Design a protein around this nucleic acid. Structure first.
Lengths: 317, 317, 317
DNA sequence: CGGGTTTTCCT
């Protein structure tokens, strides 16, 4: 598994939208529970959903897969991740629906040999014999850091006009500025492995041949998420992003680093990693840290400089 | 016995679901009675059921048991905890049904020598001669703390879309933020001990040999629950969790610590533990405390740092 | 792709306006989150939106296109970029609305062969069969650099009167001064290429013939943005602009240069460019730097003197 | 302006 926590600083941003009222376009907001010296309070803060990040990741994965020669589905070749949900998609791609429970494994292998996206990002088919496949990359909402007593975020509305020589043309757009945080998880030990229980079916040899390439592509795809190629309204509201802190852990057992809420979340996660490897009888535990804000790190930890170095190191091992 | 009270802080969460209405996925809610300065009131608040936690605990126990060589049932090798309820499971596993009341102990031992899950988590078989085994781990609903006059919890709905080039695609998801509390109990003095009354039956020597490993594995399995690996919808709604306060008590007599609703529940439970050991003629009483919010603790109390240290200490003693 | 970061110094400026209160004309202001040695703070600073920059760029593109003989739409011939959104524009230009999804490609090609502005800057038609084309040039707000603990910006108000021989004439104007920074992106590989998926439609041969001229004009149009020809109230409040630092990158793969916030943002982006070309299996990566403040640059970097040289170099390659 | 929840279980 590869687990990570990342902290970003974003200014003058509008990357996720919600239903509009009047001539105003609104930014997504959510309630958060925060702890101050006086107790616990409830606040409303701008957020960014995780499905936009999932879409960006899967689009980059499609690009890399088509570049490197891996198979890509017909519908997903165009950036429409309906996958194989409805029967219309099955008809377009040309895959017979499963007949019974015993036939499920064949259908899963057939779908899994045509589109890498269905293999990595999971899918669901509903019918007489529904077939499920959980995603191999897990994301979450992007929240500003709940540090201290004051939330380091702000939201406002802005005024815009459309010029016309014959007036008979005014709209408002919400803009936010915050210090976002988020964490991610990716289990590369289950890529290119069937999930439905059953007997062996012809075609798994090709999967075993392509396993290494699929894992390499899946690990490569994370560069988009770690770089900042996500969100909408990028044509006229291009944001100003800057990485601040990053922790990545590679292990052989389940593990979850601390959220990027406290100023000291790198020392704690490394100590916890050592103790967890000791207690769970693991055999591999490595840590990589990127720091640009000069906070406490610890001892005996590899320190990197950019994200390309981290991607290369993750690929090599 | 091992009895514990734990306090968590969760933000932007959807971990337990219930039946859906329209295009809206709903979060579990329950009524709670709360005391304010003006009297008593009834409120509707999001909660998380205990059966999700039980499933997470049993899945982790399956993983550890397979890793350490302890026997695991065939159906329970797959993460499907029907245990030995119906006749189909008995036919699959290959165990003869009990004949009379006198044969109940043999059936319990045979079931108990094949699946550790049936041993630790209890089971039921209904028929001509019913057989019961109560669970050795007990859990409860996860509730936000009912401190003060305002409940520190909030629930809202969010708007999501599925993109398509040929419109002919909209759903809503309920998201919560709360300060959750829950308590648990695990009696390790009865693990690998038959429950049905009767005579001695061949095969108990193997259970006596495996008792130590079974107890060790059961104690290890709590790390998943104390870490935060439970609940659904984790692929796109990965939650942000953080521990705040934990009290764990090891005794030789029945005891129940205070619920984590009042800010002073560590001092009270320690005083009660001392007096209860005095009054019930016990011979062992230990307490461990993890504090990360700076609330009153007391004197002469072991203070830990993480949960791995607690797990190691519980294993060693 | 062509991606750039630019730094400017502006004194006594008022280029973007918002709703006015009383006899005071206000300058656009926005919140920004800044990092200092004491933590993170929220501040209110004057800004300039990106839509004014888009209008300036599109006006210059119209001028160049009409000068070089490329087709220009009737409505956009006058500097009114409603494009083909409403039905009145369609009636004026004389293009039939699309009938079904299968006819979308024909409509896109018909619109795309008449006005280069719709081709480069994209457009949208709403109706029974909506048609979309994302802009090929992406801009953002113009924020002052968030360097150090003190923001290098200031805003004040100024007093003015109107003379009259028969009093019965007083107003206030907001004026700012800052060190602005902004970044831009332009992917020239998709200019003069249809975006809607479908079958071949007559008229694409002319598009392929005109592609070279369209790309050349689009590259030429960046001179207005890089020179300082944008914003309003230039008749009486002509600002004093001076270029300070510029980085331009030409690649075959997605890339985003570092924002012009830190004093050392040229070496970092070149190192990242090299590593990214190594990791993403690219085949082209070139950089150009203009420096007039004597900051660190690096080694093996082409150095220019003016912006016209950069424009010529970008055109030639 | 188009689009507004899909199955498989109900002791």
């Amino acid at each position: 598994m590869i687990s990570g926590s990342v902290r970003f600083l974003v200014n003058l941003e509008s990357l996720n939208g919600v239903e509009s009222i009047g001539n105003l376009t609104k930014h997504r907001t959510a309630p958060v529970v925060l702890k101050t010296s006086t107790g616990y309070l409830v606040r409303y803060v701008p957020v960014i959903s995780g499905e936009a990040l999932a879409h960006a990741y899967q689009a980059s994965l499609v690009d890399i897969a088509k570049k490197e020669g891996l198979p890509v589905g017909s519908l997903s070749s165009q950036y429409e991740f309906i996958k194989f949900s409805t029967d219309e998609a099955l008809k377009i791609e040309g895959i017979k629906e499963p007949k019974d429970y015993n036939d499920a494994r064949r259908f899963e292998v057939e779908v899994m040999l045509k589109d890498v996206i269905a293999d990595v990002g999971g899918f669901m088919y509903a019918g007489g014999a529904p077939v499920r496949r959980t995603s191999r990359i897990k994301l979450g909402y992007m929240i500003p850091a709940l540090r201290g007593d004051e939330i380091p975020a702000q939201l406002e509305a802005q005024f815009h006009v459309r010029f016309s020589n014959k007036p008979v043309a005014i709209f408002n757009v919400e803009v936010s500025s915050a210090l976002y945080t988020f964490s991610f998880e990716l289990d590369e030990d289950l890529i290119a492995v069937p999930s439905t229980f059953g007997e062996k079916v012809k075609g798994e040899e090709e999967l075993e041949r392509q396993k290494a390439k699929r894992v390499k592509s899946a690990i490569k795809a994370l560069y988009s998420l770690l770089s900042g190629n996500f969100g909408g309204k990028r044509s006229r509201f291009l944001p100003s992003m800057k990485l601040m802190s990053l922790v990545v852990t590679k292990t052989d057992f389940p593990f979850m680093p601390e959220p990027a809420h406290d100023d000291d979340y790198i020392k704690t996660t490394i100590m916890r990693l050592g103790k967890a490897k000791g207690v769970l009888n693991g055999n591999l535990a490595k840590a990589y840290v990127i720091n640009n804000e000069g906070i406490e790190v610890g001892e005996g930890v590899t320190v990197l400089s950019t994200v390309e170095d981290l991607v290369v190191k993750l690929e090599e091992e």
